[PDB]
Write a protein that binds this ligand. Structure first.
Ligand SMILES: CCCCCCCCCCCCCC(=O)O
Ligand SMILES: CCCCCCCCCCCCCC(=O)O
Ligand SMILES: CCCCCCCCCCCCCC(=O)O
Ligand SMILES: CCCCCCCCCCCCCC(=O)O
Ligand SMILES: CCCCCCCCCCCCCC(=O)O
Ligand SMILES: O=C(O)c1ccccc1O
Ligand SMILES: O=C(O)c1ccccc1O
Length: 582
């Protein structure tokens, strides 16, 4: 249609269109100041309104890629500030855009964004709510060049609502903070899952992406029939390949359509797409990708009939290896909203391997005869851990639980740095408090969901600077054998304890005056070092120490001369403790 800008502006709205342009520009010209971007947004909006008015007006004729490009090349400090990227401006448009995406530095060396005090934020919020939000929107956008914009926008609306409620509240900091933290993490989690999906689609390729996709889709639209789940899985894939390649336009358009299809054929896909499909252009996608599982038919047969009985198995498995294998997943996926996706792939794999080392031997039906029995333990392992751990997390709290966790993992890989151990042992323990609350039915998917990034997180830090071969083995292992592999790490008996660092176990009183969620990180660092000084330490021996210490803080922090015992009763502990640890 005539004038792309006109159209985009119209069904987007000036308010969003402005936010989006700001973000898109914040994602490329990551170095220019906040004001310089505001100049662009206004300049591009005023233009866009020109087209809305007269579709045949100057340049409206042009495509969105061409316009965005030309204006990007306007920035005068382009070659001085961005150097090389300025060369892109000579290339004709297809190449020009492609050239810009190659230079969208994934990780700029920009400072850690700090959190000003609640009082200043609320005041900046009030005084000028507009530039307050758009200025931070810009702060995030430039630091995460690949974050799908519409999504980043959605996180903004949520940030706004937090102030509207918290700043008007009696106790602001008691309101704002916890809402902000949860909001931060969620956004961090969101960003990590986006790099995952893209890293995988490249390491393991399309096939594995598709398998993971068929499973997850059929687990959500169990009432849809395989032909449909296949159509969706194809398109959904086209989407991710593109949205990873970076181009925001292509991506947004692909995602738009995909949501049209789903809502047009809503009746044959899910009954839960009700709300989402009623939402505006912008949220449909985000919404749809977040919809809850529909409910399965309960009129479903048995995977044993079609996949283990009839002598037409291999006949069918060879007519087209992948489709058949796909159907196995689909079928098994929809009867199991409670299984984690890697678990389902872990089965399909086992089944495939079997039909392989079977349809080539003597009597086929006697070979692939008892597969479902080879599954039992595959389904059992993740389930047992879930319960075994959630059980413990109910006994001790989220904190005491995290401590049981770092004592464990420190013993397994004592070669890891203490900050990293603590970092991990915490996000891990956090998932416990964020999943164990769920009824068993939805526990395994929860864990998988989080755990996935906490592991991808770990596998990157370690990549930057490896320390252990095991951890490197698991990190490079099949993205489906990744969790079992870490689950499989055994205590390290090669390891040789760090020498007694008298300093390491010295405390003053700063701990009686540090934020609780800061007063632990301290304790949780000493523990790691205690376990590293004497790993042969028993669960009882250890606990005996953590008791003499836990008391020592109190019955001494709350003691007139707040620093005598600490360097005083502190010597007794350090001297008594190693006498009880040989
Ligand atoms: C995702 C869009 C965010 C837009 C700006 C909302 C206000 C953010 C306030 C400051 C917090 C930065 C992150 C942090 O919590 O450390
Ligand atoms: C240079 C002009 C940039 C104009 C903004 C284009 C972005 C349009 C986004 C459309 C949203 C589709 C919704 C979705 O898939 O979540
Ligand atoms: C405190 C964290 C508790 C985490 C739950 C225990 C771990 C269960 C295994 C998670 C894996 C789900 C996917 C899979 O089968 O690998
Ligand atoms: C920095 C080193 C961290 C080492 C700990 C490995 C992470 C394991 C988490 C995933 C598995 C949880 C269940 C299990 O421990 O079997
Ligand atoms: C060589 C003996 C060193 C003894 C001192 C080690 C102190 C370890 C701190 C334990 C903290 C447990 C956490 C808590 O008390 O909540
Ligand atoms: O800190 C945030 O608010 C945030 C939001 C979206 C993506 C990554 C993030 O760190
Ligand atoms: O990201 C999407 O657009 C999507 C659409 C339909 C189902 C699952 C999804 O993640």
């Amino acid at each position: 249609h005539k004038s792309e800008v006109a159209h985009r502006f119209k069904d987007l709205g000036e308010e969003n269109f402005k936010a989006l342009v700001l973000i898109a520009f914040a994602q490329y010209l990551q170095q220019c100041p906040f004001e310089d971007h505001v100049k662009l947004v206004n300049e591009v909006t005023e233009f866009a309104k020109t087209c809305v008015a007269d579709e045949s007006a100057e340049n409206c004729d042009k495509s969105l890629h061409t316009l965005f490009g030309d204006k990007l090349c306007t920035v005068a400090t382009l070659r001085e500030t961005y150097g090389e990227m300025a060369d892109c401006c000579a290339k004709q448009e297809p190449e020009r855009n492609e050239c810009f995406l190659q230079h969208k530095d994934d990780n700029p060396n920009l400072p850690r964004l700090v959190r000003p005090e609640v009082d200043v934020m609320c005041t900046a919020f009030h005084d000028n709510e507009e530039t307050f939000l758009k200025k931070y929107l810009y702060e995030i956008a430039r630091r995460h060049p690949y974050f799908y914009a519409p999504e980043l926008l959605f996180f903004a609306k949520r940030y706004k609502a937090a102030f509207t409620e918290c700043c008007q509240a009696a106790d602001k900091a008691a309101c704002l903070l916890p809402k902000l933290d949860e909001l931060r993490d969620e956004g961090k989690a969101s960003s990590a899952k986006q790099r995952l999906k893209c890293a995988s689609l490249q390491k393991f390729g399309e096939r594995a992406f598709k398998a993971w996709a068929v499973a997850r889709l059929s687990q959500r639209f169990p009432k849809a029939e395989f032909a449909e789940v296949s159509k969706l899985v194809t398109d959904l894939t086209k989407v991710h390949t593109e949205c990873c390649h970076g181009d925001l336009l292509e991506c947004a358009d692909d995602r738009a359509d995909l949501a049209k299809y789903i809502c047009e054929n809503q009746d044959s896909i899910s009954s839960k797409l009700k709300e989402c499909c009623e939402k505006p252009l912008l949220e449909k996608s985000h919404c749809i990708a977040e919809v809850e599982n529909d409910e399965m038919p309960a009129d479903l047969p048995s995977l044993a009939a079609d996949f283990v009985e009839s002598k037409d198995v291999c006949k069918n498995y060879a007519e087209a290896k992948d489709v058949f294998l796909g159907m196995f997943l689909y079928e098994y996926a929809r009867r199991h909203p409670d299984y984690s996706v890697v678990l389902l792939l872990r089965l399909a794999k086992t089944y495939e391997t079997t039909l392989e080392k079977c349809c080539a031997a003597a009597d086929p039906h006697e070979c692939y005869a008892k597969v479902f029995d080879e599954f039992k333990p595959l389904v059992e392992e993740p389930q047992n851990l879930i319960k075994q751990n959630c059980e413990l997390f109910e006994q001790l709290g989220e904190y005491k639980f995290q401590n049981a966790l770092l004592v464990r993992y420190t013993k397994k890989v004592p070669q890891v740095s203490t900050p990293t151990l603590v970092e991990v042992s915490r996000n891990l323990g956090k998932v416990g408090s964020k999943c164990c609350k769920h009824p068993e039915a939805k526990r395994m998917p929860c864990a998988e969901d989080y755990l996935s990034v906490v592991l991808n997180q770990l596998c990157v830090l370690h990549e930057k600077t490896p320390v252990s071969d095991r951890v490197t083995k698991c990190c490079t292992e099949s993205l489906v054998n990744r969790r079992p592999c870490f689950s499989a790490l055994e205590v390290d008996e090669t390891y040789v304890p760090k020498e007694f660092n008298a300093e390491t176990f010295t405390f003053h009183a700063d701990i009686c005056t540090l934020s609780e969620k800061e007063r632990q990180i301290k304790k949780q660092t000493a523990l790691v070092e205690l376990v590293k000084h004497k790993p042969k330490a028993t669960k009882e021996q250890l606990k005996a120490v953590m008791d003499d210490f836990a008391a020592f803080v109190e019955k001494c922090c709350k003691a007139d001369d707040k620093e005598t015992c600490f360097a005083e009763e502190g010597k007794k502990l350090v001297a008594a403790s190693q006498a009880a640890l040989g």
